[PDB]
Design a protein around this ligand. Structure first.
Ligand SMILES: [Zn+2]
Ligand SMILES: [Zn+2]
Ligand SMILES: [Zn+2]
Lengths: 75, 98, 183, 129, 435, 89, 334
């Protein structure tokens, strides 16, 4: 599969927002509506187009509070 | 002064975020968006004036707070005006076992 | 008719019989007496003898989903619970009418006679007024709460002054001294 | 009237070759709401991810702790510091950071989120220097 | 109440119909007036219920002061239906597959099963479907052709007899279609052909149309809709008055120009043909996606010519003091830093290092440094915006940013000479930026 | 000069001093915050012009020429003393 | 109807370090502050019961605020009001709103909208208390509001009734459901016995349908005593006793059931008859005995709650006389 728009359709068909950001946004959006496309938010372009920020290295891993540690050492 | 596509690509390659968050939201058109989480459509929320409603399913509204950009909301409004509906699924809640 | 506002209630077309004209407030899918499909415009005037209620088989996971959401009205919660085997209120109200002479397509109860149609609509009104009634609301709330519980528990100048020849005329007057040097 | 500065025209030339009766219920379809997930924490002896923090994860821990020290003021550093960044960094190095690293590896269709919770105080720390 | 933090895990696209506009819309556009004094007219295309684009008035719908308000959709109840401009191709491919008299498909749904669902309807439209005899109602299927002088109008030819397929007639025909035909042709149930004809368009929120040029098209669309009588009932071959026919054409043409003006797209059925349309804002480098989404204009950023300074470390950048006093670093006030931030606070704008901004958590407001004589101190929880000092980290970037090293972090070295305005870096550092 | 009593649109943090007959007098140094060619409307709303540039300039030009529509416009010229600065090519 | 409902929500934790020092207590306080006194997700939420499940206190990813959110699943005491529900105390607020508006002063906050088209209202001035019957219009629990919104009419005993034709037998699970329901009615009956009896007699006579039922004859304390008055026609049965013996699995319910207006509404009495001896204006409804027992039992629930709250709110004879324009009005429309 190429790196052209045709190659991106084959590898990532459901990533509508990635394909709109590449080229021809009106066309891919038109077929997205008629196909009732469900676009999961992943990668970089899809969360960026939705105003969010990609889940990659710095924010790849969730950070949670240590309830057990805070209870012992911060009360 | 613009941080174009290539600057974002470079920061992404560096795995930055946070800096991307700061520059693209805090030092740009960073807004905060509300989604019903039940219908996926943008909803109305205000804390000063106590309004908590969505026009899709009103009584069963579950407004969530989603970080976003005003450019993204404008883009989604432009898409909606083109009669293609955009529903945001929103990440499901997780609960550790009892 | 107020009966043809629920998607499950489906009429049957009487081709050319003029027994009972029914005008649908919105687009309602109808069946020919032969069992084939061909509709008409919305609100278009069709003569109907037959009122089939399709008993849809629901999965219990669907009621689990809506109880997890926990904001659906008692009417729709009872509808979905009766769709599965959790409750039988719709079945209990409707199977009493029976008269399954038509068969064809999905499982459910049908009518083909006038008095059966009247019994059908009366039973429908009573069933849906029970679904809005307080008792069924309490019962469905018990059902939902308990099963989710046990699932969790288990898993002018400006024109001239800017004119250049005036500067030329001024500068030659200054040379001759006809005007003061300054302005 | 010469107008000039035309809005041009835009052309797209490509094709996206994206390779039991039914009626309308409102509950079988739809449900934009996603089912609530249950968190499955992989046991400490079954974790197969690195026990050394990545530079990304260590940086995220330090940044989160520094922001929380910017809003709060409580810490476990005997040696006091004038900057929240320094306090968070030394908390990470001294292995007394009150944060946990949750690494998520699955989204099971049954609504099951499988994660590995890693303790930064027991993990290796990257260079960061 | 509380709106808990949430993240968008997926986005689902669907065709928006009349019901979606009706339930989503916050009001209905009824008048063509623009302003009642200084306020938008109630029922106008500027009504504040759609949102606010001025600091004088709020949204009414959400009661936010413009910046926090994000606009709300409106409704314009068209007296006659219109076709959806983006889905004219889908309308064409649906018309020549279904029986115009009984709604049942004229094609064989059995033969189209073995293909994939997305291609089923396209392959159904590919077949001849000309003069075919319907099995269930014995009505001959006409010929569907695209009107060659516009992108939306349809022409139904019955063995040489032609009658205009008006949007109302197409709407009735599509309403005749059952869900079984839609599913067995691969189209999603949310993509039912009925949704392709609109009786109530969406007037977009004022967020995407601020400033009082696209509003001219909508206002023209509102005006010409009022001229259409509300009691139009166009059966096929009615031969409606030509004055109404011209009026109806402008209603459909203006809506098409509102969305797809100056946008060709490959699947545009048609041929013959101001304010850029809604879909024109998206594509190209200067479009919404590539300019505003994939990139951004940012604050607190400076640009200057670079020059060599052999006395700076490779990880250090020479920052002129004029720029260091302009850009600021937000330091919160706590017990551990209150002593350190005091010299910054006391200096103010007068001396470097200083600061001119203080955020008061007690008031949730930002104060300039001239009006804090009564403060005399900062409380814990305050945020102080202090001048950049030597040792601060700065991001240093050369366009084009081609390599990973094109953006790097340098330790600031503030140059206190007021005659210097360049960014000074060690020469060996230039290999990072190809500078 | 926009009179401070009426105001209703005065620029935040502008000077509005050093204006004579609506224009800064020639030979006067103008800094970033200062107002030049003061203008008003609704004759009141404020339509004056702020300097804006970081580099302070000096004014040696004042005139009110008739435009092509026989209308008066400002057209002041600002002078900068540009030695060879570090970073000049 | 008060009840318990399980909710799901995501909080926002501005200080996760200080929050986690006591997770459960702080979580409960935050939930109580957010949701108590406000209707949320088609329920009113009167009191927050302890949490069931919760998430780890995550950290907000898409912003540099450093705050956490954490998801919470909790159960709460919710008051849900239904159609045909009986409310016994409504205060009129304003007469300038000619459509007539009221505010309930019971434990379930509701703002009522009694239409003025009916002539049985517009006689109650501002400041007086008068009960309301909730119409078949559904109570609107608009989220975030301090009280429910509904429309209903001033209660007239409504001398109409419904006959019930059963064709399905009860199972032990349904038997347990209605045994919980009769547990509720036993609690209500004990509460009724705890009151000053004469006020219940007065309010029961006032809202009795058919005639004044002569005089004080046939004491009606009802609690554990199947005593009654009027005795219009046919032999009645104790629905409670039918329930317990059905819990013992003796009696079948395959018959016609009704509670005509001649019965005392708050009594647990009803008629079980084999071939529809009732003077019904409506067609018998063909459905299972679970439906019948649910409907009749909750009818008794709301009638007895109605009389209990009326007796409780009218502790003195002066308050009844202050609202004199209602009592003679209802006596007129018997
Ligand atoms: Zn909603
Ligand atoms: Zn708004
Ligand atoms: Zn046909």
């Amino acid at each position: 599969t190429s790196l052209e728009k045709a190659g991106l359709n084959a590898r990532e068909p459901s990533n509508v927002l990635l394909r709109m950001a590449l080229s021809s946004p009106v066309q891919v959006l038109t077929d997205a509506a008629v196909d009732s496309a469900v676009n999961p938010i992943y990668g970089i372009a899809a969360p960026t187009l939705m105003g969010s920020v990609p889940r990659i290295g710095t924010m790849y891993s969730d950070i949670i509070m240590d309830e057990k540690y805070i209870t012992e050492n911060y009360k | 002064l613009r941080l174009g596509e290539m600057e974002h690509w470079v920061l992404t390659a560096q795995g930055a975020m946070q800096t991307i968050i700061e520059k693209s939201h805090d030092d740009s058109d960073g807004c905060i968006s509300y989604i019903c989480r039940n219908c996926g459509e943008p909803a109305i929320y205000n804390a000063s004036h106590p309004i908590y409603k969505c026009m899709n399913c009103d009584v069963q509204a579950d407004i969530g707070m989603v970080d976003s950009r005003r450019s993204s909301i404008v883009f989604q409004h432009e898409m909606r005006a083109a009669n293609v509906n955009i529903t945001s699924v929103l990440s499901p809640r997780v609960f550790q076992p009892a | 008719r107020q009966l043809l506002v629920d998607p499950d209630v489906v009429p049957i077309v009487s081709e050319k019989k003029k027994e009972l004209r029914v005008r649908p407030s919105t687009r309602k899918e109808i069946f020919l007496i032969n069992g084939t499909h061909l509709a008409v415009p919305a609100e278009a005037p069709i003569e109907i003898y037959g009122l089939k209620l399709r008993l849809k088989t629901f999965s219990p996971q669907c009621f689990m989903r809506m109880a997890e959401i926990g904001s659906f009205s008692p009417e729709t919660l009872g509808y979905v619970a009766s769709g599965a085997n959790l409750t039988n209120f719709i079945r209990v109200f409707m199977k009493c009418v029976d008269q399954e002479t038509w068969k064809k397509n999905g499982e459910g109860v049908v009518v083909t006679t006038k008095e059966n149609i009247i019994q059908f609509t009366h039973q429908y009104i009573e069933l849906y007024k029970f679904l809005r009634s307080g008792g069924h609301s309490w019962l469905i709330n018990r059902l939902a709460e308990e099963m989710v519980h046990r699932k969790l528990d288990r898993e002018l100048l400006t024109e001239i002054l800017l004119d250049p020849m005036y500067d030329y005329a001024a500068t030659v007057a200054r040379i001759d001294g006809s005007i003061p040097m300054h302005k | 009237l010469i107008m000039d500065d035309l809005v041009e025209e835009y052309v797209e030339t490509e094709e996206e070759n994206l390779v039991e009766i039914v009626e309308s219920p409102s509950i079988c379809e739809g449900f934009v709401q996603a089912s609530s997930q249950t968190l499955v924490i992989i046991p400490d002896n079954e974790r197969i991810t690195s026990n050394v923090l990545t530079t990304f994860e260590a940086t995220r821990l330090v940044a989160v702790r520094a922001q929380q020290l910017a809003i709060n003021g409580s810490t476990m550093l005997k040696k006091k510091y004038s900057s929240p960044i320094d306090i968070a960094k030394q908390e990470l190095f001294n292995r007394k950071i009150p944060l946990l690293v949750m690494r998520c590896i699955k989204v099971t269709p049954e609504g099951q989120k499988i994660v590995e919770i890693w303790n930064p105080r027991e993990m290796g720390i990257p260079l960061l220097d | 109440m509380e709106a808990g933090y949430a993240e968008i895990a997926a986005v689902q696209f669907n065709i928006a119909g009349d019901n979606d506009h009706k339930r989503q819309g916050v009001m209905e556009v009824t008048i063509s007036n623009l302003f009642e004094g200084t306020l938008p007219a109630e029922g106008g295309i500027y009504d504040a219920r759609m949102g606010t684009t001025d600091h004088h008035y709020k949204c009414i719908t959400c009661s936010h002061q413009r910046k926090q308000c994000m606009g709300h959709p409106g409704i314009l109840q068209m007296h006659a239906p219109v076709l959806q401009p983006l889905f004219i191709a889908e309308i064409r491919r649906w018309l020549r597959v279904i029986c115009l008299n009984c709604g049942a498909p004229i094609v064989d749904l059995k033969r189209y099963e073995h293909l994939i669902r997305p291609k089923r309807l396209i392959e159904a439209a590919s077949s001849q479907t000309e003069g075919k005899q319907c099995y269930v109602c014995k009505a001959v299927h006409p010929k569907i052709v695209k009107d060659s002088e516009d992108y939306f109008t349809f022409w139904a030819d019955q063995q040489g007899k032609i009658d205009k397929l008006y949007p109302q007639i197409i709407r009735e025909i599509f309403s005749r279609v059952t869900y079984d035909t839609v599913v067995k042709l691969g189209r999603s149930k949310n993509s039912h052909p009925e949704k392709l004809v609109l009786k109530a368009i969406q007037i977009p929120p004022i967020s995407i149309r601020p400033g009082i040029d696209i509003n001219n098209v909508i206002q023209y669309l509102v005006r010409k809709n009022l001229l259409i009588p509300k009691d139009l009932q166009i059966v096929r071959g009615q031969k409606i008055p030509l004055n109404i026919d011209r009026n109806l054409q402008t209603i459909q043409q203006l809506y098409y120009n509102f969305l797809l003006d100056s946008v060709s797209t490959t699947a545009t059925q048609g041929g013959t043909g101001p304010a850029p349309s809604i879909m024109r804002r998206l594509p190209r480098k200067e479009g919404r996606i590539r300019k505003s989404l994939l990139g951004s204009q940012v604050w607190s950023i400076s640009r200057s010519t670079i020059c060599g300074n052999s006395d700076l470390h490779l990880d250090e950048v020479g920052y002129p003091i004029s720029f260091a006093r302009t850009l600021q670093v937000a330091e919160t006030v706590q017990h551990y830093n209150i002593n350190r931030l005091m010299p910054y606070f006391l200096n103010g704008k007068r001396q470097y290092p200083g600061c001119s901004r203080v955020y008061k958590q007690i008031t949730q407001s930002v104060h300039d440094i001239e009006g804090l004589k009564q403060d005399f101190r900062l409380e814990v929880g305050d945020i102080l915006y202090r001048d950049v000092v030597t040792g601060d980290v700065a991001f240093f970037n050369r366009q084009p940013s081609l390599e990973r090293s094109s953006i790097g972090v340098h330790r600031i070295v503030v140059l206190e000479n007021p005659k210097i305005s360049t960014f000074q870096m060690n020469v060996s550092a230039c290999a990072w930026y190809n500078a | 000069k926009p009179d401070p009593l009426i105001t209703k649109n005065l620029k935040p943090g502008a000077n509005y001093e050093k204006l004579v007959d609506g224009f800064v007098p020639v030979g006067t140094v103008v800094k970033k915050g200062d107002i030049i060619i003061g203008k008003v409307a609704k004759i009141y709303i404020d339509r004056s012009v702020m300097y804006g540039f970081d580099e302070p300039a000096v004014v040696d030009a004042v005139m009110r020429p008739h435009g092509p529509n026989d209308e008066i416009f400002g057209l002041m010229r600002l002078r900068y003393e540009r030695n060879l600065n570090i970073g000049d090519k | 109807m008060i009840d318990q409902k399980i909710f799901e929500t995501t909080l926002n934790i501005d200080d996760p370090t200080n929050f986690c020092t006591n997770v459960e207590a702080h979580l409960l306080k935050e939930l109580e502050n957010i949701y108590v006194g406000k209707c949320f997700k088609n329920s009113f939420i009167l009191n927050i019961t302890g949490v069931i499940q919760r998430s780890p206190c995550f950290i907000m990813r898409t912003n540099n605020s450093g705050r956490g959110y954490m998801h919470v699943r909790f159960s709460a005491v919710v008051s849900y009001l239904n159609a045909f529900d009986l409310i016994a105390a409504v205060k009129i607020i304003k007469n300038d709103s000619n459509i007539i508006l009221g505010e309930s002063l019971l434990t379930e906050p509701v703002t009522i909208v009694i239409p003025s088209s009916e002539s049985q209202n517009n006689v109650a001035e501002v400041g007086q208390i008068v009960p309301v019957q909730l119409a078949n219009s559904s109570v609107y629990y608009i989220p975030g509001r301090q009280q429910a919104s509904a429309t209903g009419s001033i209660f007239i005993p409504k001398h109409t009734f419904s006959v019930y034709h059963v064709q399905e037998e009860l199972t032990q699970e349904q038997a347990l459901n209605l045994t919980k329901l009769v547990n509720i009615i036993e609690m209500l009956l004990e509460s009724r016995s705890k009151k000053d009896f004469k006020q219940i007699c007065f309010f029961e006579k006032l809202y009795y349908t058919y005639s004044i039922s002569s005089d004080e004859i046939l004491d009606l304390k009802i609690w554990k005593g199947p005593k009654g008055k009027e005795m219009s026609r046919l032999k009645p049965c104790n629905v409670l006793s039918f329930l317990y013996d059905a819990l013992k699995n003796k009696n079948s319910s395959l018959g016609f059931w009704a509670r005509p207006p001649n019965l005392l509404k708050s009594s647990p009495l009803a008629y079980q008859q084999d071939q529809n001896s009732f003077n019904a204006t409506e067609l018998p409804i063909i459905c299972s005995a679970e439906v019948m027992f649910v409907t009749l039992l909750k009818e008794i629930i709301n009638y007895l709650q109605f009389i209990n709250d009326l007796c409780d709110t009218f502790n003195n004879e002066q308050l009844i006389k202050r609202h004199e324009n209602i009592w003679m009005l209802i006596e007129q429309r018997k």
